[PDB]
Amino acid sequence: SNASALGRNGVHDFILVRATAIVLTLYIIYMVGFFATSGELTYEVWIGFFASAFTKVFTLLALFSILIHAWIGMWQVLTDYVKPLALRLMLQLVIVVALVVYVIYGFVVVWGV
Amino acid sequence: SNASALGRNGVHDFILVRATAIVLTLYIIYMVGFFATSGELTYEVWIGFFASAFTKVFTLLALFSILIHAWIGMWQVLTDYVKPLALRLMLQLVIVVALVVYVIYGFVVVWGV
Amino acid sequence: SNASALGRNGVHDFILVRATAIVLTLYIIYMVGFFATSGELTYEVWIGFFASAFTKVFTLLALFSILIHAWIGMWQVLTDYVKPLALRLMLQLVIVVALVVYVIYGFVVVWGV
Amino acid sequence: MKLPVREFDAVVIGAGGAGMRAALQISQSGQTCALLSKVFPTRSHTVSAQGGITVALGNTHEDNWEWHMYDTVKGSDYIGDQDAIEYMCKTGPEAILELEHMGLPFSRLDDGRIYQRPFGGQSKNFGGEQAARTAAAADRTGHALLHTLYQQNLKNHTTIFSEWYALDLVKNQDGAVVGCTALCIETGEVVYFKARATVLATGGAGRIYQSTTNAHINTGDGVGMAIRAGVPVQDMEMWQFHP
Amino acid sequence: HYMMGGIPTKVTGQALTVNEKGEDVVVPGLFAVGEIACVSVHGANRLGGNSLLDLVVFGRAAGLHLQESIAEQGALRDASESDVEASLDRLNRWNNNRNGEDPVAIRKALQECMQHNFSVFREGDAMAKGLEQLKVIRERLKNARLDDTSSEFNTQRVECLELDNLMETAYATAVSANFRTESRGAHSRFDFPDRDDENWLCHSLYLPESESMTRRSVNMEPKLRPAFPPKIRTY
Amino acid sequence: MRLEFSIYRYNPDVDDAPRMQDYTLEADEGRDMMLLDALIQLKEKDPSLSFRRSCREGVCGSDGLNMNGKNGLACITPISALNQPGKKIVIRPLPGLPVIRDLVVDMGQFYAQYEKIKPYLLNNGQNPPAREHLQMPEQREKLDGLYECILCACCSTSCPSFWWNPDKFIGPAGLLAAYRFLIDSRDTETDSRLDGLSDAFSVFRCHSIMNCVSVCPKGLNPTRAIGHIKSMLLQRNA
Amino acid sequence: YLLNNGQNPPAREHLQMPEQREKLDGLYECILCACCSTSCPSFWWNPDKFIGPAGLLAAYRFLIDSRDTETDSRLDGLSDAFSVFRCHSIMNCVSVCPKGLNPTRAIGHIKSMLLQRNA
Amino acid sequence: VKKQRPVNLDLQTIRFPITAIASILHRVSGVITFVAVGILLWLLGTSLSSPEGFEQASAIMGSFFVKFIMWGILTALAYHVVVGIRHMMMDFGYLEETFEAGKRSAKISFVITVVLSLLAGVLVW
Amino acid sequence: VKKQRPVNLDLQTIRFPITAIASILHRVSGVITFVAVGILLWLLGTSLSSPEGFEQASAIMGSFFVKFIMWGILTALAYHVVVGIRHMMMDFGYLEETFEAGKRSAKISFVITVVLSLLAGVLVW
Amino acid sequence: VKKQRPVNLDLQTIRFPITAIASILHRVSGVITFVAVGILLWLLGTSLSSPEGFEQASAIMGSFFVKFIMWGILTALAYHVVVGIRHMMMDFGYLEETFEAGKRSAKISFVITVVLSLLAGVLVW
């Protein structure tokens, strides 16, 4: 392994990317289906939709899948277009921290409403 | 590694299974001890027990251990009784998603009460 | 790998330790900066500071980084000063459980306030 | 041209102890070798050996090889080739030591040396007191010997044709054996192996009687093939029995 | 229990044969090791334990000098297309016989005769009757059939070929036994219980071509130690 | 007492699928013969029957059959153990491994798994002894119950873990040989083998089913060998 | 190059049926002109690590050939996160291929074999 | 070789000892408890939802059918836990791995599982 | 060898097919959506904060500038999703990997992306 | 070889430089802070519990004993952080790895740790 990516080998990253991508496609389908049929949108319906357990659990799962997928993809992109070692390491650290903050904020927001 | 299981090698899966099994046995002991001494059970005592920090933290830790243990065991069972590759991969993906949803729902339930 | 540590190889543990250490230094800087400028501290300002989303998200991220860093360091220390296999395994299991409980309690506390 | 032909520097018809031993010796010397066998290389009759290998290793007690040679000559009724017996008794120790090195599990004495048990027919000082120069495992000496020989063959990647039946030798017009035609028991085909050294190791033939201790695969195939090719059989009027 | 003889070979394994004068000569290309090879390391009685050492040492020897033997024998001409079938005629005859006699009964009768007249206790006219019965059973076997004629793992054909070889070996052994007029080692007749050394201190040889018996000198001259003179058998 | 058998017949030349053919063979009530004797006496009547038998004593591992459900040796199993009141005597090949003929099964996977562990000694070469290596009587006792494997496949062909993954799973006999060669004090390269069989399929596929020991003809215990291998893997790679 | 263990040696040249040979068409005609690798951004960004379209084509050609009996060794050899999976189906090699080959399908088959084995 | 060879895998003809029954039932109970975790999680969410949700969960649990499902889940989980602790003891080295010891442990596990199943049945009921 | 050799990598002189444009735009959209996830997360936090927070988020979204940013994010994410599903289909084996098939799939993905971008624009607007 | 050979490992006879003292104290402080994280987490949970919980946490912190424990935890964590940043600088290449440079860095870390310990003591007190 490369000791710096959220993966184990080529097959590991491949399968992880594909699974998290399927999950995120399902999440996008759900979100677009809601936003389309919502018609008129007010704070009332907004809170009624983001107050259900299914919606919040689904958003958290989508955030986790996004964490994994974005980590893999950004590691790939950085290894492709960043030759310097220290710069690439710092950029990947910033990206992973941003993704973990994404997940923690998604939580802090879903358990708040 | 097999690039598709929540493990690294034979020893890794072995130790992980054994540790999560000890943890889940402790959790089952706690739960049975409560359910036995509870005597008459009403919403009052139910909420009083699932409102303590120790109980909820313990339930979340047990859910995490169950995630790990079930992933390992179901990967083993699938590799044993599922020759087709696509079917086995889809089944393991469904199982892992179900377990992550188990954990997220345990959370959404414990921080709700 | 050693099938018992939260790492993959030497480089993996090295990079993980260094990244989580940078993160924890940032967290300590934030906490000391708050505690210094706080002046007089009362329940009012305490709750006002630990009620912000940034503060709680930052504390959760710091708890995760502490989990990782402490796991790595304690595995190293145990492998250094514990020859018996069963004793070392039990001690590392206790340490990892204590760290996961640290994280879950940090959550149960931050989403409580 | 109407029958498949397989070229090999040598063809050993047999996978028994001596069979695979000679096969490995030939192979290690940089020579192609086809080790045929009627059954699996570890199913030969030599697996039922329990007495042990007699040799003057000197492990148990101090002695020489000429005592063993005298014992052999006296027990053979003065019929065996004295030169061959002398050579065998002189080479025994080194052969058994190389065998041990191969990985054969040998019973160990207190000092960590190969174990030997006093067996009948062994005499000291050309018929003196008892001897204990019988090297062997606890009760599976031939078993372990054959299994270690097969393990060595596997390690050396020997060309083995398992469950191939040697039909009959094949000589040229000059009279030199050019090879041997055999049959693939599994599929049932027939193929002629062409080798400049057709070694025979079929083994015993006790099955010609109404009661024997030899395996069912002991049918004297080699003696029959030789008699058909024109090679004489010696001392066939002497068979060791048991009451 | 054990076959004290077989293909007479040298210390290296090369099978020997005499041609028209009784002088030994190495059959080019043919070798032999193990119990099948009659190296004459056990004589008229094999000592328990010497079998494994014989196998190991003589096989290792045969394998060590294979290059020297191939150099000695020189280049060997190829085999003619007719030799393959001159050898496969046995299998062909075995396959072609759909009405032949029962091979299991032939083997049973042969084994009965060999165990009744060619065992630890042998006799003169008993061995003569054994030779005659062996001749009869061989003429019979010359017609044995092959009931099952499958192709994938046909054990019946292997058993029929093994029975052919067994009949050959039994005939050779009976001839050899009826030839030696003495009582030496395992070989112990009832009309000659005296082990003679003036004329029977030598190996027996079976000429298969003419089905004849002959004598062969025993090499009694070791290299490193003085030879052992024959003595009187002890209890 | 007329013995009635139901034998697993199959011929790839003239057939389409395996079948079970019935057979009858009487035997004197005086003696009690092993299953191999009955198989021989039946093939004497129906030459089409095919079964392997070399030693007749049970020391080489040739006639490994699956009698009345359990695997065993036809030569060391009397008719009493199989003969029951009002029930036939079924003789089926070893499960899992392919079938080649009436009762002979293709044992290629078994030998392949045996070879995959490198079953032989491995000595570096330094510190060579003056003669045969010197190991004390206890180091030799450490080898008992580990080198007597006659390789009859009666252990691997009775383990579901073998049926489900023969190519990957090494099998009870393979693991027994691996432990035998790992504990032997003559090979000084145990770490190489340990790293070789540290896969999630090679060793840890054993769930202590304990069927090999139940069917072991030579009275061995591959379960303890696999347990020792697991213990050594834990000691090293943990 | 080919890799044959040595056991079960044929009497003559190895015997592979016409379909096993057809399995090799479009995989051994590589004239090695570099027009494929020198047109892939994945090659420009990481030549040392990335094997390239021609390299992957040769790898698949030697993996599918029924004459080499050590495919698992090669599969483990090129199971790295840089050696094979750096191909994003850009499909520029096929567009520039002079000999009318398709390294994209070869890389896809290699990915399929890696998934079948190491997954 | 036009068609591949057959393979005798007719489980209706093979025989297994009690030690294999133990492991097969352990795997079955593992899957059963894998599903029971989600079932119980849903039920506990309903309960902890609110007082009316607790009343609804109690009414559901009051069903004879639901009672049977809950008792079966409890029995399966108890059997799994007992057999798994037995397997872990055998692994660590607190139980001899002989056929006799294996059968003894299997019978003891079966009896303890029956005991725990009854004990949990008196609870759910 | 005092100075290393040059290398012709002037992308302004090389030419790429539509299949390479597809992958390059897929990577660009991947990074764009990586940032858009955080942007949308902040906006959703503001919304779900409270009624006044929801009003503030609605006012922000009512900005022409914010409208353009949201439409661009939606279009980028749609293009990424479509091209990624196409890549996954090609991987699994639901699309032939010939140059012709590649260009066909690229054009179909472009048209579907335009469709989805318009459909999302009518929403954000 | 009836008994294994001895080994001279009497740490009371060996001598270590300041650079080894630095690393040993760094490990000690690492374990101390590993436990202090849990201690402080419990105390912060008590504080954030509720107003009465905050009053209770303040009363606990008002203890001379608790004051000493808190000051020790702060000093240990400060020493660990300083020595760890020094180690990371040495690794990355911002400090020469010569014996002289090592001792210089060790002394500077000790002085900065004393400074930070005093600064945190004036806080806890």
Ligand SMILES: Cc1cc2nc3c(=O)[nH]c(=O)nc-3n(C[C@H](O)[C@H](O)[C@H](O)COP(=O)(O)OP(=O)(O)OC[C@H]3O[C@@H](n4cnc5c(N)ncnc54)[C@H](O)[C@@H]3O)c2cc1C
């Ligand atoms: C029951 C018994 C116990 C014994 N105990 C002892 C003892 O304690 N000590 C001792 O020193 N000796 C003992 N012996 C004798 C000694 O072990 C044997 O003579 C020994 O097995 C001979 O080895 P071999 O390789 O020559 O024979 P084998 O090992 O039988 O070699 C023959 C091999 O060639 C194969 N083969 C045969 N015919 C053909 C053919 N036509 N085509 C192809 N392959 C063929 C066979 O399948 C077999 O693999 C014992 C013998 C028996 C029968």
Ligand code: HEM
């Ligand atoms: C609580 C939820 C649990 C779930 C969902 C679960 C699920 C599973 C599954 C499906 C398997 C596969 C078994 C096999 O492959 O044969 C397994 C294995 C195992 N389980 Fe559990 N289990 C749980 C709890 C426990 C507990 C509390 C223990 C306590 C010992 C335990 C012990 C084991 C052991 C030791 C194994 C591996 C045994 C082997 O591989 O032979 N499990 N688990």
Ligand code: HEM
């Ligand atoms: C939702 C947030 C998402 C983020 C932040 C994200 C981010 C990324 C990034 C930066 C890459 C790198 C692409 C490259 O290296 O060329 C990537 C790869 C990829 N993305 Fe996403 N993505 C997301 C969602 C999705 C979804 C829903 C899919 C559905 C199919 C998807 C499919 C893919 C695929 C298949 C790849 C790998 C393709 C390849 O390597 O050639 N992504 N992702």
Ligand code: HEM
């Ligand atoms: C916040 C909670 C922390 C805990 C529980 C913790 C725990 C540990 C432990 C027990 C070790 C083992 C040290 C050894 O094996 O010698 C260690 C290593 C280390 N710690 Fe921390 N630590 C924490 C924070 C930090 C921070 C903020 C830094 C900032 C630089 C840091 C820097 C390091 C470094 C660089 C190492 C490895 C140094 C080496 O291996 O030589 N730690 N940690």
Ligand SMILES: COC1=C(OC)C(=O)C(C/C=C(\C)CCC=C(C)C)=C(C)C1=O
């Ligand atoms: C104890 O060893 C055993 C198994 O385990 C390795 C099995 O598998 C089976 C057969 C069971 C099968 C194929 C289904 C398994 C059930 C589920 C729910 C996966 C038997 C007879 C067995 O004796």
Ligand SMILES: COC1=C(OC)C(=O)C(C/C=C(\C)CCC=C(C)C)=C(C)C1=O
């Ligand atoms: C489809 O294959 C291609 C790439 O991918 C491997 C590229 O990279 C580039 C050049 C683009 C670069 C260097 C910047 C990439 C942009 C971001 C935001 C990382 C081209 C022309 C290309 O054809």
Ligand SMILES: COC1=C(OC)C(=O)C(C/C=C(\C)CCC=C(C)C)=C(C)C1=O
């Ligand atoms: C700087 O290098 C050193 C160590 O580290 C590798 C040590 O270990 C020790 C001895 C300390 C021991 C055995 C206990 C360590 C304390 C804890 C709390 C684990 C010394 C003298 C040392 O000089």
Ligand code: SF4
């Ligand atoms: S230990 Fe296993 S392989 Fe060896 S004989 Fe017994 S059952 Fe057969």
Ligand code: SF4
């Ligand atoms: S396939 Fe075509 S472009 Fe690729 S290396 Fe071969 S000749 Fe060159």
Ligand code: F3S
């Ligand atoms: S699982 Fe099977 S291989 Fe042996 S250890 Fe148990 S019987």
Ligand code: F3S
């Ligand atoms: S990425 Fe390049 S190497 Fe081939 S498969 Fe696509 S053109």
Ligand code: FES
């Ligand atoms: S009879 Fe040959 S193995 Fe039992």
Ligand code: NA
């Ligand atoms: Na002989």
